[PDB]
RNA sequence: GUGGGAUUGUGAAGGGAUCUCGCAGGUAUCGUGAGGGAAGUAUGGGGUAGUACGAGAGGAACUCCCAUGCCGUGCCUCUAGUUUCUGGGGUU
């Protein structure tokens, strides 16, 4: 529940700024709009891009009105872009999904719909507890 | 000396003279390295450690280890993209 760039192997970037992904927890939000990604060091013209396990800054576009019109923190748990594990397997999900967390990584809400990537679960133990299945 | 050419424009075939040029290098490898260019640069995590310090609240760092951002030089085993192999099938 901290900086995750140095604790994770390279994962192919999936979600640049502006991507809208599903919200997999039961907070009340339906989707999340990616504003930025933590740990992004700048490069000219290059959009900040999120992948599995990344914390992102996001806003809710659809869902409970109490959750909208504000900047929140979320963690990516599923992505449609395929990445390659060190064991040589190339794997991808059917959808993109995120989960709303506090800046400390603690999961707001109490349940997760759909599976959770192992890369995301290893970096966020609180998210791994509520995962129906890992990878 | 020898070999090869030539001389100034109204003819031809012969003789001299006088000039210019060639006369020892070719061909194929392996190396030297003067000079010039010049590139790697950052972050996080583990541990140190809830330790030093501090009344408390708070709260570090180096050896070492593991990743990552940007940049650079390549490569095509995998994954992805691309098809005028119009390859093989469909279909109006
Ligand atoms: K030099
Ligand atoms: K120089
Ligand atoms: Mg621009
Ligand atoms: Na292919």
Helix H, strand E, coil C: the string for A108-129 is CCCCECCCECHHHHHHCHHHHH
Nearest nucleotide (CA of A8 to C1'): B67
Q: Which helix (H) or strand (E) holds A32?
A: strand A31-37
* Residue A28: burial class (beta carbons within 10 Å; 0-12, 13-18, 19+): middle
How many CA atoms lie within 13 Å of A126's alpha carbon, on the beta-carbon side? 17
Yes or no: say if A35 and A58 are a contact pair by the CB < 8 Å rule: yes
- Tell whether residue A3 is among the known ligand binding residues: no
* Residue A77: burial class (beta carbons within 10 Å; 0-12, 13-18, 19+): buried
Give the Å distance between the CA of A18 and the centre of ligand 4. 29
């Amino acid at each position: 529940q901290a900086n995750v760039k140095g604790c994770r192997f390279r994962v192919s970037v999936a979600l640049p700024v502006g991507a809208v992904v599903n919200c997999a927890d039961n907070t009340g939000a339906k989707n999340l709009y990616v504003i930025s990604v933590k740990g992004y060091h700048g490069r000219l013209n290059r959009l900040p891009s999120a992948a599995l396990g990344d914390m992102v800054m996001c806003s809710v576009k659809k869902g409970k009105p109490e959750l909208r019109k504000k900047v929140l923190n979320a963690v990516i748990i599923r992505q449609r872009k395929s990445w390659r594990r060190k064991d040589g397997t190339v794997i991808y999900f059917e959808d993109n999904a995120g989960v709303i967390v506090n800046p400390k990584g603690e999961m707001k809400g109490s349940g997760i719909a759909g599976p959770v990537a192992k890369e995301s679960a290893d970096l966020w133990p609180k998210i791994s507890t509520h995962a129906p299945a890992i990878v």
